[model samples]
Target: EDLRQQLQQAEEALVAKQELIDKLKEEAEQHNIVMETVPVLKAQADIYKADFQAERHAREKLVEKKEYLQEQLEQLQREFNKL
Candidate 1:
């Protein structure tokens, strides 16, 4: 009877350990999925940053072009007045 009780206790301990092992496996899978997606997320963010930089550069070029045209207009007006 004592041997039977000891066997039963050993079985219960094994079952508990198995349950904990399964839980750890599930959590490791979840963590791996997030780790796998991290690089994709970083690439997406970099693309958005590049797009924003291109837009800013285009806007600056437009402003500079407009200023040059305005200066030319003023110079032409001065020439006409002298004529």
Candidate 2:
């Protein structure tokens, strides 16, 4: 009867460690899902970077032409003023 009591006590201790292992397994599963989303976020950032890089190039040309035409407009007014 005494050994029977010890057997039950041992089983209870085993359950305590088993619960810890179970929690770790769940934690590993959760970590894998978080890892999967990290790459998707990187992909979106890459697309945004590429798009903005192209837009910056386009705006450079736009500014150049805008300034060049403004000078033309001033030159026209100078000719008209003399006339």
Best by TM-score: 2
In model 1, the worst 10-residue window by lDDT is 1-10
Distance from true location, Cα of 49 in model 1, Å: 2.5
Residue 16 in model 2: lDDT: 94
Residue range 63-83, candidate 1, lDDT tens digits? 999999999999999999998
Per-residue CA lDDT of candidate 2, range 1-83, in tens? 79668978889898998799989999999989889998899999999999999999999999999999999999999999998
Over 4 Å off, model 1: 1-5, 79-83
Assess candidate 2 and give its lDDT.
0.93
Q: Each prediction's Cα lDDT score?
A: 0.93, 0.93
Q: Give me candidate 1's TM-score against the actual structure.
A: 0.63
